[PDB]
Write a protein that binds this ligand. Structure first.
Ligand SMILES: CCCCCCCCCCCCCCCCCC(=O)OC[C@H](COP(=O)([O-])OCC(O)COP(=O)([O-])OC[C@@H](COC(=O)CCCCCCCCCCCCCCCCC)OC(=O)CCCCCCCCCCCCCCCCC)OC(=O)CCCCCCCCCCCCCCCCC
Ligand SMILES: CCCCCCCCCCCCCCCCCC(=O)OC[C@H](COP(=O)([O-])OCC(O)COP(=O)([O-])OC[C@@H](COC(=O)CCCCCCCCCCCCCCCCC)OC(=O)CCCCCCCCCCCCCCCCC)OC(=O)CCCCCCCCCCCCCCCCC
Ligand SMILES: CCCCCCCCCCCCCCCCCC(=O)OC[C@H](COP(=O)([O-])OCC(O)COP(=O)([O-])OC[C@@H](COC(=O)CCCCCCCCCCCCCCCCC)OC(=O)CCCCCCCCCCCCCCCCC)OC(=O)CCCCCCCCCCCCCCCCC
Ligand SMILES: CCCCCCCCCCCCCCCCCC(=O)OC[C@H](COP(=O)([O-])OCC(O)COP(=O)([O-])OC[C@@H](COC(=O)CCCCCCCCCCCCCCCCC)OC(=O)CCCCCCCCCCCCCCCCC)OC(=O)CCCCCCCCCCCCCCCCC
Ligand code: HAS
Ligand code: HAS
Ligand SMILES: CCCCCCCCCCCCCCCCCC(=O)OC[C@H](COP(=O)(O)OCCN)OC(=O)CCCCCCCCCCCCCCCCC
Ligand SMILES: CCCCCCCCCCCCCCCCCC(=O)OC[C@H](COP(=O)(O)OCCN)OC(=O)CCCCCCCCCCCCCCCCC
Ligand SMILES: [Ca+2]
Ligand SMILES: [Cu+2]
Lengths: 63, 57, 216, 135, 576, 102, 143
């Protein structure tokens, strides 16, 4: 797995952080900024899962 | 007798026409260069004179 | 069949009056456009001042001086000082073609900015956007023009070599018994024992690209 | 069959640019850099003006960012290595492909060593071909 | 069946060069002047994905402004311009041109032709579509801005009296030019199927992508003239002072009838070719034939017939269309569209599936599109559409459905035919990252919109009140919208990197089990497609070419019935 | 014109949809397909009539709607069917004349 | 091209049926969610659509009845039956892009409704279509 779990850890810290910020801002323009942070968090979550989903059954060899 | 263009193919008169609106003797477009022609030809009979150019160095 | 200067519609000269689209003639529009695109960069040196429209005159002067001295900087940067009587096709000299085209884009943008308010009135663009198109475009436009022009030059060049190597594409597609589709080429010179032409050298001249040019 | 070898003319290869002998080809890299950085400086100088809106400023700074990253990757010239993997039923490099259409037409090559039932299933009566392959 | 002589001095033909090895100046003047159907196809596809990025950016601005109740950075006018141009760009500058680009590339390879019938008309179609795009988007350069009456351009809101900006004219001529492009492309493809097939490539041996391109060419030729006529009628009205679409002339519903008679067949024109791409992909990775081939052809042609009679289910809440007729007709056209899923399951039933990227994208397409179509039959029933029309439920329906086809199956086609197009493979891992990002973002965006639409949110609403109860749903939807927007970053990187540094293809068929004829030729094909042709006997000639020991087996297993004609006597005598 | 049958050795079995004896080219078949698709509209008509009647409206015309529905459905079904059979006649005599079906 | 010509009669019969059905229904049937009267858009649209499919089906059939048995319309054709010339195809042309540019100038003139733009765009368009249609026939220069 490797970087899979690493991504999943990092992304959670980003996602939760955005969830903390979207409650503070809260309807201003910066709410959008908070959402973007949250999206990037979710992106890195899915990125980690995708890496796992590839190394579960790789369709390519490093040859 | 009626006129026929000198670039027109000759044909079997029982076979109708060289081309008509519904049908042709070819799957694509007929060539502008006459389908009776066979290419390539010799470069001598294309008439292209390839220049000889030398410029001052 | 067409008016050019209805002086009667303009009335006599008065220092207090003016019109909206009061442009000069087309061969001068570039100077007016320069005056429009130059920002308000003015120097105030104690009791003296250098107006902003000084830099216009500097810029225009530079362009003019550059034009009059092109053969000499081309001699400096090509290293050629030979005696020539045969012209070059513009595709065969891409740097000069691209420089000339980007200078034409520069001059056309100065001309179009010199009449930008008529452009805005008639095509409904923001006049502020038009002066900014002038400013930003006199940088990015010549660059884009140089790049596009250079690659099109080399492409025409390479298209000539294609036909001096393989001959004119006749457009006739012929199927071989193995199934292959082959396009009949017409060699412009002699041929090898396997039918492939013996590639002719490029001679600086125009190479025909279709059978109707050979007369067929 | 025959091909002429390339030649360099003031630093321009005739393989890259065919007519390298006939005119001025390729102005060099430092002049591209000089022009681009002077233009960047002007694109920054426009921010010093009497204008009041910052739509203009966003345009100027975005186009400046594009110019700067362009000139940066022109200066440092990035490159990547070809991907050295094998995906699906692709074979390693150097493998030679057969002509399957010729093999099918001739009943040789990859279409060699077909059973009699397999020859009948393609409408080849095996009597014809047994005289000529695998006799 | 004849057999050739083992000729002397035979060596296979030379393989063309892959992408990324190009010298400068190699494509500029060629692009400008080419009549090669397959360079033109690559240009179509690159162009349409660039417009996809534009329209999607507009959509993400829409989702940003719907994040919280007040208007944070957009105005009402700018929000209206944004959804109008998002809809127009995504349907007419992404969808239809990518349809015709995939057709241009693969269709002559599928039927065994060297060129298309009318090469310069093909070039014209590409360029007129690009000019239509430029014209349509030029409205944003005005001070007032683009058109802002929705991509449907309902009347009298589209009259000059009610939408006077110049962008409203630009939009019209934009869609007109794109339609001109489409009809050129349609003419080309239809003639190319009728007049340039290979020996033994009878009609019922073509692949199913070819059949779908056939019927959608017929539909496009029906409908795009009608949109040009109606919209030039609108432009006539606006510029000359005409009165055809006057409300007291019944002009509102004149426009609606004409528009939807064009417009529902257009969504079928966008759906069918991508169903065809998926019907190419699913049998290759299952190592199994396409189930129910002739039945699939009949279902395709059934959709082609029915699509012209279902149009006015977009007008149930107008109080001016006969409800039972169009309701029943929609319920009928649901049937052949759904039979396709049964055929794909039959193609997967007890197969040997391998999960390369195109199979992942295709099964994701099936899962995505099923829910969209199930949502569609609710709208087919007027009692339910009375509540659901012009709600966010409708947004969710057609986004599930247009992503299912035109996005999921478009990326499936890209991954499937990138080796053939370029001679290089793409990075499978980056493709799976792209897929999972798109999948998660998409379902997170548009699933919750069913609920907020049922709850009472209308479409095309720039602003809402915090008392409506809509806020939390919009917030979830926008977060996953930005995720779905990030999904294209690995896709762009994968295309760019693999185009010039991707794994080289050394085989005619890098997936192994290519059915159609395009896998009987090299990667990339030569200029005139084929260096030699095989015997066409099945509808999957390439499979028969690469695995002759299977040609006895499949013929025995093709049917479920106990057909015994492998013991039949000889027929004929000799000549061939 | 080309002959009626083509050379098939014993053991060969084709994929033969576009053969000269196949109903997919005999014109009757496709008209029958049109009429069979068209017959379903009469089923729609009779269902609309009966459904409107069941809730108490269309009362002056629902019997006429039912009549036109059933007669339209049956005539389209019938003439489409017999057209299909007239398209599939040559294949049937082919299946009799030889053991081959595929 | 038998099957292609013949499968155009499915949609022809269907669209004609739907035309007559829609016409009678919209003029005679009444429901509370619409006003009785013949709906002319759908009427004309469906009958002209059946006209389009009739047009293609009839022309292709009238051609099919006098084309020979081609190898691509034959179940056991050999690959060498189409050996020979296939036809002429344009290898290259600058005039498609030219035509798109002419149509662009015309369309922007129509947008703004500048009369000179409409005139120039129509002139450009006739010119570029003419030059497209004269490409492979221009004389050799006689000097
Ligand atoms: C052009 C004329 C032409 O090709 O005519 C064919 C033919 C060539 O003559 P010929 O008889 O074959 O003689 C032999 C030649 O020497 C044959 O020599 P040749 O084949 O070398 O001649 C062609 C040559 C001829 O090239 C030239 O002479 C160049 C002249 C064009 C100037 C640039 C265009 C202006 C754009 C302004 C935009 C503002 O072009 C080239 O070699 C390369 C391409 C040059 C044009 C590339 C396009 C410009 C791209 C830049 C666009 C700007 C984008 C940014 C905009 C700003 C953003 C804010 O000319 C005519 O007969 C046409 C007459 C005019 C009608
Ligand atoms: C280090 O040694 O530096 C000195 C280095 C030493 O020279 P070198 O040893 O001879 O060789 C140096 C390299 O090998 C240089 O080698 P290279 O050959 O690669 O570079 C040569 C380059 C060297 O020069 C440069 O790099 C130039 C400097 C960079 C460009 C600056 C652009 C800035 C853009 C900003 C925009 C400004 C205006 C906007 C207004 C803004 C405020 C309102 O010069 C050129 O490329 C010559 C271009 C000549 C321009 C004039 C062309 C006009 C054509 C007009 C056509 C006429 C007819 C039609 C026109 C339309 C009318 C109908 O360069 C110089 O001496 C020149 C530097 C300046
Ligand atoms: C006229 C201008 C000119 O002379 O430009 C020539 C010059 C090409 O250089 P060259 O010296 O003539 O030939 C050497 C090239 O390296 C030879 O070409 P190449 O090696 O660059 O390969 C062709 C090129 C790609 O081809 C081109 O760039 C030219 C054809 C497209 C141009 C028309 C559409 C552009 C968008 C319009 C939007 C408005 O490949 C790439 O750029 C990499 C692959 C595509 C990713 C980059 C594009 C991202 C957006 C599209 C996403 C697509 C998703 C996947 C779809 C499946 C793809 C198979 O630049 C262009 O052609 C630019 C095209 C306009 C942008
Ligand atoms: C509205 C009027 C539209 C124009 C007239 C009607 C068009 C069809 C004429 C008959 C025909 O099919 O001829 C083909 C036939 C070409 O035969 P070929 O040379 O043996 O071509 C064999 C190659 O394989 C051909 O292969 P290729 O692909 O290399 O060549 C493509 C070529 C030839 O293509 C074909 O022959 C096959 C396709 C049929 C032609 C039309 C294709 C679709 C056109 C574009 C999409 C639809 C546009 C709809 C516009 C109206 C919207 C309401 O396409 C054209 O020439 C079509 C014209 C381009 C129109 C572009 C839209 C503007 O034409 C001729 O040989 C006759 C020469 C003159 C024909 C064009 C005359 C145009 C005059 C009017 C220009 C517009 C201005 C009107 C102003 C009104 C007062 C203000
Ligand atoms: C690619 C593009 C599209 C496709 C394909 C598509 C397919 C359908 N649509 Fe749609 N749609 C509507 C109904 C359907 C139906 C019934 C289907 C069918 O093709 C769905 C069949 C597909 C399936 C996948 C069915 C399920 C599959 C299987 C295998 C099970 C067997 C099926 C059974 C038993 C029948 C289901 C029965 C159940 C009880 C569930 C209606 C009205 O009935 C409206 C207007 C409503 C309004 O105005 O608000 C509408 C609106 C739109 C718009 C509106 C745009 C705008 O702004 O106005 C777009 C772009 C669009 C796209 C597309 N739509 N559609
Ligand atoms: C084939 C046809 C279509 C596709 C595909 C499509 C895609 C989307 N649509 Fe849509 N659309 C809507 C939302 C979306 C979203 C979110 C996407 C997504 O696919 C968009 C994402 C796709 C992209 C391609 C984005 C590319 C991203 C870029 C270029 C930026 C990436 C960089 C980032 C994020 C920065 C990096 C940050 C880091 C931290 C690294 C919504 C509502 O959320 C409405 C209704 C609005 C209303 O008020 O009624 C709507 C309306 C329509 C209409 C009706 C138009 C009208 O009513 O006038 C049509 C026909 C249509 C078609 C289509 N639409 N859409
Ligand atoms: C416009 C109208 C569009 C068509 C609408 C549906 C009507 C078509 C299907 C039934 C009516 C036509 C009769 C079939 C004629 C025919 O081709 O015979 C069956 C043929 C078998 O081939 P063979 O064994 O060789 O014998 C015939 C000679 N070829 O073919 C087969 O192998 C038959 C296989 C069985 C299934 C056939 C079709 C299934 C239909 C799928 C959905 C249709 C969607 C319509 C809307 C609901
Ligand atoms: C054959 C004759 C065709 C060519 C005629 C050219 C003259 C253009 C003209 O007629 O100008 C007046 C016109 C007024 O419009 P009109 O067409 O009369 O229609 C009513 C308006 N809806 O005006 C217009 O419609 C707009 C014209 C304005 C053109 C742009 C002006 C600003 C920029 C110009 C820069 C300088 C010129 C550069 C050109 C040369 C470059 C090398
Ligand atoms: Ca908001
Ligand atoms: Cu619809």
């Amino acid at each position: 797995m490797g970087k899979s779990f690493a991504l999943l850890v990092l992304g959670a810290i980003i996602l939760a952080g955005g969830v903390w910020y979207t409650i503070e801002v809260g309807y201003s323009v910066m709410a959008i900024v908070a959402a973007l942070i949250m999206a990037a968090g979710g992106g890195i979550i899915t990125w980690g899962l995708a890496v796992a989903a590839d190394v579960n059954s790789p369709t390519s060899h490093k040859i | 007798k009626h006129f026929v263009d000198p670039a027109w193919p000759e044909h079997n008169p029982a076979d109708g026409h060289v081309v008509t609106e519904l049908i042709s003797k070819v799957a694509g477009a007929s060539s502008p260069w006459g389908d009776d022609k066979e290419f390539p030809v010799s470069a001598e009979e294309t008439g292209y004179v390839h220049p000889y150019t030398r410029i001052n160095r | 069949v067409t008016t050019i200067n209805a002086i009667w519609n303009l009335g006599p000269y008065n220092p207090s009056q003016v019109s909206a689209g009061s442009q000069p003639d087309v061969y001068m529009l570039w100077t007016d456009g320069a005056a429009r695109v130059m920002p308000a960069w003015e120097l105030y040196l104690g009791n003296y001042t250098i107006p902003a429209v000084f830099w216009v005159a500097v810029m225009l002067g530079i362009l003019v001086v550059l034009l009059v001295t092109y053969p000499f900087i081309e001699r400096k940067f090509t290293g050629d000082d030979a005696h020539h009587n045969l012209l070059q096709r513009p595709r065969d000299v891409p740097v000069r073609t691209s420089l000339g085209v980007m200078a034409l884009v520069f001059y056309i943008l100065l001309t179009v900015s010199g009449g930008n308010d008529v452009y805005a009135m008639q095509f409904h663009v923001s006049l502020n956007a038009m002066t900014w198109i002038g400013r930003i475009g006199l940088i990015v436009g010549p660059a884009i023009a140089y790049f596009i022009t250079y690659r099109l030059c080399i492409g025409l060049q390479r298209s000539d070599r294609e036909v001096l190597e393989h001959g004119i594409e006749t457009g006739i597609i012929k199927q071989m018994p193995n199934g292959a589709f082959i396009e009949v080429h017409q060699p412009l010179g002699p041929v090898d024992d396997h039918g492939h032409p013996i590639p002719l050298p490029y001679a600086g001249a125009a190479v025909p690209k279709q059978m109707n040019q050979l007369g067929y | 069959s025959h091909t002429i070898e390339p030649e360099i003319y003031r630093g321009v290869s005739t393989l890259d640019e065919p007519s390298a002998a006939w005119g001025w080809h390729g102005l060099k890299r430092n002049t591209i850099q000089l022009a681009g950085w002077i233009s960047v400086l002007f694109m920054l100088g426009y921010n010093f003006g009497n204008h009041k809106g910052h739509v203009e400023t966003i345009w100027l700074l975005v186009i400046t960012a594009l110019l700067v990253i362009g000139l940066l990757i022109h200066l440092f010239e990035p490159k990547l290595s070809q991907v050295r993997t094998i995906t699906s039923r692709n074979k390693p490099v150097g493998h030679v492909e057969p002509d399957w259409t010729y093999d099918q037409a001739t009943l040789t090559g990859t279409w060699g060593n077909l059973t009699d039932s397999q020859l009948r299933s393609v409408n080849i009566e095996p009597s014809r071909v047994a005289h000529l392959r695998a006799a | 069946t004849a057999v050739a002589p083992r000729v002397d001095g035979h060596v296979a033909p030379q393989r063309p060069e892959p992408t990324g090895h190009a010298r400068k100046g190699s494509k500029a003047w060629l692009m400008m002047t080419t009549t090669d159907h397959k360079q033109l196809g690559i240009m179509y596809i690159i162009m349409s994905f660039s417009f996809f990025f534009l329209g999607g950016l507009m959509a993400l601005l829409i989702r940003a402004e719907l994040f919280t109740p007040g208007l944070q950075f957009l105005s009402n006018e700018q929000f209206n311009q944004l959804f109008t141009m998002h809809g127009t760009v995504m349907l007419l500058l992404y969808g239809t041109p990518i349809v015709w680009g995939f057709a241009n590339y693969v269709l002559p390879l599928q039927i065994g032709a060297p060129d298309v019938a009318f090469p310069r008309l093909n070039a014209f179609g590409f360029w007129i579509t690009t000019v239509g795009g430029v014209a349509m988007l030029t409205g944003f350069l005005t001070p007032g801005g683009a058109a802002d009456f929705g991509w449907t351009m309902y009347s009298p809101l589209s009259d000059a009296i009610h939408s006077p900006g110049l962008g409203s004219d630009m939009w019209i001529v934009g869609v007109g030019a794109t339609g001109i492009g489409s009809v050129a492309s349609a003419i080309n493809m239809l003639t190319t199927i009728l007049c340039l097939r290979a020996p033994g490539m009878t009609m019922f041996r073509m692949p199913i992508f070819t059949w779908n391109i056939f019927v959608v060419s017929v539909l496009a030729l029906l409908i795009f003239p009608l949109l040009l006529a109606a919209a030039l009628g609108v432009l006539y009205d606006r510029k000359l002072g005409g009165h055809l679409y006057d409300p007291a002339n019944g002009g509102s519903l004149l426009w609606q009838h004409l528009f939807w008679f064009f417009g529902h067949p257009e969504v079928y024109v966008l759906a069918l070719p991508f169903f065809g791409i998926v019907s190419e992909i699913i049998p290759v990775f299952s190592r199994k034939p396409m189930f129910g081939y002739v039945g699939l052809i009949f279902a395709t042609l059934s959709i082609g017939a029915l699509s012209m009679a279902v149009w006015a289910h977009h007008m149930f809440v107008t109080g001016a269309v006969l409800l039972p007729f169009f309701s029943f007709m929609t319920f009928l056209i649901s049937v052949p569209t759904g039979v396709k899923f049964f055929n794909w399951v039959g193609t997967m039933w007890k197969g040997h599936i391998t999960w390369e990227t195109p199979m992942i994208w295709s099964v994701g397409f099936m899962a995505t599109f099923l829910f969209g179509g199930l949502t569609g039959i609710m709208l087919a029933s007027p009692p339910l559409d009375f509540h659901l029309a012009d709600s966010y439920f409708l947004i969710a329906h057609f986004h599930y459905t247009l992503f299912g086809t035109v996005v999921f199956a478009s990326c499936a086609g890209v991954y499937f035919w990138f080796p053939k197009m370029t001679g290089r493979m793409m990075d499978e891992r980056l493709g799976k990252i792209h897929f999972w990002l798109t999948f998660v973002g998409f379902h997170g965006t548009f699933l919750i919109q069913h609920w907020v639409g049922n709850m009472g949110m209308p479409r095309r609403y720039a602003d809402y009140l915090d008392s409506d109860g809509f806020t939390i749903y919009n917030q979830i939807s926008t977060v996953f919208s930005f995720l779905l927007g990030l999904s294209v970053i690995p896709f762009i990187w994968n295309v760019f990197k693999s185009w010039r540094y991707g794994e080289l293809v050394t085989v005619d068929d890098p997936w192994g089990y290519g059915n159609s004829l395009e896998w009987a030729t090299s990667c990339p094909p030569p200029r005139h497609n084929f260096a030699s042709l095989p015997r066409i006997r099945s509808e999957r000639p390439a499979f028969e070419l690469h695995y002759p020991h299977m040609i006895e087996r499949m013929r025995a297993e093709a049917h479920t019935g106990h057909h015994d004609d492998i013991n039949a006597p000889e027929l004929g005598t000799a000549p061939a | 014109p080309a002959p009626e049958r083509m050379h098939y050795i014993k053991g060969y079995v084709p994929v033969a949809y576009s053969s000269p004896h196949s109903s997919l080219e005999r014109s009757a078949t496709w008209l029958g397909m049109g009429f069979l698709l068209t017959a379903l509209a009469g089923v729609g008509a009779v269902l609309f009539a009966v459904g409107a009647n069941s809730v108490g409206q269309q009362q002056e015309h629902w019997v006429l709607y039912s009549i036109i529905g059933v007669v339209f459905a049956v005539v389209c079904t019938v003439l489409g069917t017999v057209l299909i059979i007239k398209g599939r006649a040559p294949y049937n005599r082919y299946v009799k004349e030889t053991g081959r079906t595929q | 091209m038998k099957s292609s010509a013949k499968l155009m009669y499915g949609p022809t019969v269907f669209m004609a049926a739907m035309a007559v059905i829609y016409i009678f229904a919209t003029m005679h049937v009444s429901d509370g969610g619409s006003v009785k009267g013949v709906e002319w858009v759908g009427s004309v649209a469906l009958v002209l659509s059946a006209g389009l499919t009739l047009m293609l089906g009839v022309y292709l059939h009238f051609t099919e009845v006098r084309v020979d048995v081609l190898p691509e319309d034959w179940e056991e054709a050999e690959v060498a039956d189409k050996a020979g010339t296939l036809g002429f195809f344009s290898p290259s042309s600058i005039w498609p892009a030219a035509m798109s540019g002419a149509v662009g100038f015309l369309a922007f003139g129509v947008v703004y409704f500048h009369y000179w733009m409409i005139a120039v765009g129509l002139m450009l368009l006739i010119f570029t279509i003419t030059k497209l249609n004269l490409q492979y026939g221009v004389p050799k220069e006689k000097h």
